[PDB]
């Protein structure tokens, strides 16, 4: 799962979607002209996403990735450097530890707050 954790970190820090094997739990269309549809794949999920808490967590991660991709497309930059904000996300190393601990939720909330702050600053100043 070293590859899956890196893909999740890339999706949660830059919103870049690179799933050439249909393994990631989220993928967007246009791979209506400007607004693309984001489909969540339930066959390759990491949790059940049936309870309200898990659904809200998945929606928060998806919104973080969407905001990251939108910021990238607006700034015409290939990636969002970490110096653009005061929030830094650490890469996942142990998938079992990330699943069993609240570090996953902590990192998700951190990157979500970072993406929301960046989006608000951009749409308020530019």
């Amino acid at each position: 799962s070293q590859d899956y954790c890196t893909m999740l970190y890339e999706w949660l820090t830059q919103g870049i979607l690179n799933d050439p094997y249909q393994e990631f739990m989220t993928y967007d269309d246009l791979e209506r002209a400007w607004d693309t549809q984001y489909f969540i794949r339930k066959d390759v999920l990491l949790r059940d996403c049936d309870s309200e808490e898990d659904k809200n967590l998945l929606f928060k991660m998806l919104r973080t990735g969407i905001l990251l991709k939108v910021v990238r497309a607006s700034l015409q930059i290939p990636t969002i450097p970490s110096n653009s904000s005061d929030i830094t996300i650490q890469e996942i190393n142990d998938f079992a530890d990330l699943m069993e601990g609240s570090n996953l939720e902590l990192y998700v909330d951190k990157c979500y707050s970072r993406a929301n702050e960046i989006f608000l600053k951009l749409f308020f100043q530019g």
Binding site: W34, A73, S74, L75, N83, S84, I118, K121, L122, Q125, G126
Partner: protein, 75 residues
Amino acid sequence: QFDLIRLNNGTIELNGILTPKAEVLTKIEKTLNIDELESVHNTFLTNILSHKLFATNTSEISVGDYSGQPYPTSL
């Protein structure tokens, strides 16, 4: 900074991406080259041509009422 496009049904659509009002997180002249100048000259020429009074023997123009003849033909 906003590029609009009109349609036959009276709707207006924004062309391309809407750039922000010159604000990038940071903590010369836009001149036209050979092909751009030639293309803009061609657009100027076709805009001169597309005048209703200059559109002679065209299907897009409407003839004058009670006459049955287009405006350039009557001219």
